[PDB]
Amino acid sequence: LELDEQQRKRLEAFLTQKQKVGELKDDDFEKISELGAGNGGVVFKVSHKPSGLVMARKLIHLEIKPAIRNQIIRELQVLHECNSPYIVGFYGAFYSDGEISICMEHMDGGSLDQVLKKAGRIPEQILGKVSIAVIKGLTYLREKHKIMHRDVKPSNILVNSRGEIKLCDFGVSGQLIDSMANSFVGTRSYMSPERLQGTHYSVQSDIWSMGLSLVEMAVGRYPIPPPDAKELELMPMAIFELLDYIVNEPPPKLPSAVFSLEFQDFVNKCLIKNPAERADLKQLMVHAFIKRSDAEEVDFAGWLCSTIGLN
């Protein structure tokens, strides 16, 4: 799995720090400030009292029949087996007050959506590295536990000042998906055209989501409908016409003047409507853009902390 030693020693450090904090319950924790809210939940920076560590706690509020509530908690505990340098450090899952809480790593810089609004645009040099991180996370996930992510978007890519990139909120539990997560629709859509028409989808849908996300971060704007010609130089629609656009119109593409062929082609291959012809992860891993950025020399942590103002 090409597991670096640097990586295995901060993986070891947090699995053994994992049993040092032990077990879990509500009043062990204490608030700090508002990290945010979405898809039926709020997550807050927390301090655990037995162990001075600061964590991030995800509370979502679900009054339903308790049988499926416990099926959810037991399906969610598999997060304990999921451990890679590219998937958020998971610590524990518990039921309390009919409010499921997930305790995870705190990520200093938040989500690439958050990163993006202050940063305005994300350079190409760096989007190379985040792309490698995402394909690694998705392959790790597909090979090791045989799952797919089902919810890839910039607000689910998390960054820290130590310079790592990892994915949060992947679809680990089927019950929680069918009973809560499915019912939400936001103001934007990252869903593939084959998921929207309800066929069987695969990790291909995730390739599509990642491609749309890379466009959004590269140009600073949610990419569909495509920016108008004058709006492009500077750099009101309901949800159904968005979905109908996604299914019945050409996909976004990066502007041809600004980014290399390798990047334009990477995203063009992620955004092919037919999932059979869309690149899979094996193919994306050996793509020109990837071979370039993997062998490049970027100091990520520096860009991040001078982007947002950390240390």
């Binding site: 499915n182 019912s183 629709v185 028409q197 309901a238 159904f240």
Partner: protein, 277 residues
């Protein structure tokens, strides 16, 4: 409404155990001596236009009485607190009834239950009341008898959030394409285009449930359902995928018709259900 303005003689009615929450207040069981269902609402709006429409619809419901429509009994409003009192329905929801192993539906029973529902909706339409929420969970079946509940209720504007949406799947299956196209965060349910035609589309979905004892679309991300419903594609593919009988399927294709104007009236639907096996 101080409840003494209604034709049901009432000295006192007592709250009993609750039996479910929802977007429109909390529903308790109660004793008027007869059992009743009591729905508790609270009015955020506090603007007297909302209470004016509430008064309008509640005295409109007074004028109804029909053996397939739940009996509307009373409503009182001590704003912001309001209460709607209807007759309590013994028996099981048609929803949980078709989904029972032990239950035995057949080419006759389905048509009979459907004709009951059609008579009820036809009454409601004659008096110019649109249900706006016909679905399998709002029809009750006790031995022979079939009763429609929870009608007219979507027209009111009490406390129900964020600027996203949360849409149950069971509900969206009953929604016609006109409606789901207009859904978008920050849009309230009251602004949606419910109608008589949308009601017959929802009847189409309840008939499909009578045939197949399940949803026509398997649980999935709500954005997917919105596209498939509002494109008309999803309903064409369901009519393709596993079929029922030709005369049976004709009623489904009529009720689910993409263009709302080509949908049949409930009076006509009675006839269509008559000329069957």
């Amino acid at each position: 409404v101080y409840l003494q303005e209604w034709d049901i003689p009432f000295e006192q009615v007592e709250l009993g155990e609750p039996i479910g929450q929802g977007r429109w207040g909390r529903v308790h069981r109660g004793r008027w001596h007869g059992e009743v269902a009591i729905r508790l609402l609270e009015m955020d709006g506090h603007n007297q236009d909302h209470l004016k429409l509430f008064k309008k619809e509640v005295m409109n419901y007074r004028q109804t009485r029909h053996e397939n429509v739940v009996l509307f009994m009373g409503a009182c409003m001590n704003p912001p607190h309001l209460a709607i009192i209807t007759s309590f329905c013994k028996g099981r929801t048609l929803h949980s009834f078709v989904r029972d192993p032990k239950t035995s539906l057949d080419i006759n029973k389905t048509r009979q239950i459907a004709q009951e529902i059609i008579k009820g909706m036809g009454y409601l339409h004659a008096k110019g009341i649109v249900h706006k929420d016909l679905k399998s969970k709002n029809v009750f079946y006790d031995n022979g008898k079939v009763v429609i509940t929870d009608f007219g209720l979507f027209g009111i504007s009490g406390v129900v959030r964020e600027n996203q949406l949360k849409l149950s799947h069971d509900w969206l299956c009953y929604l016609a394409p006109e409606i789901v196209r207009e859904m978008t965060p920050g849009k309230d349910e009251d602004q949606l285009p419910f109608s008589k035609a949308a009601d017959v589309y929802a009847f189409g979905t309840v008939w499909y449930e009578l045939q197949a004892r399940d949803w026509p679309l398997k649980n999935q991300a709500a954005e997917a359902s919105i596209w498939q419903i509002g494109s008309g594609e999803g309903m064409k593919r369901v009519l393709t995928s596993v079929s029922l009988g030709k005369e049976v399927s004709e009623i489904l294709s009529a009720c689910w018709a993409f263009d709302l104007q080509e949908r049949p009236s409930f009076s006509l639907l009675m006839d269509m259900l008559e000329k069957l096996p």
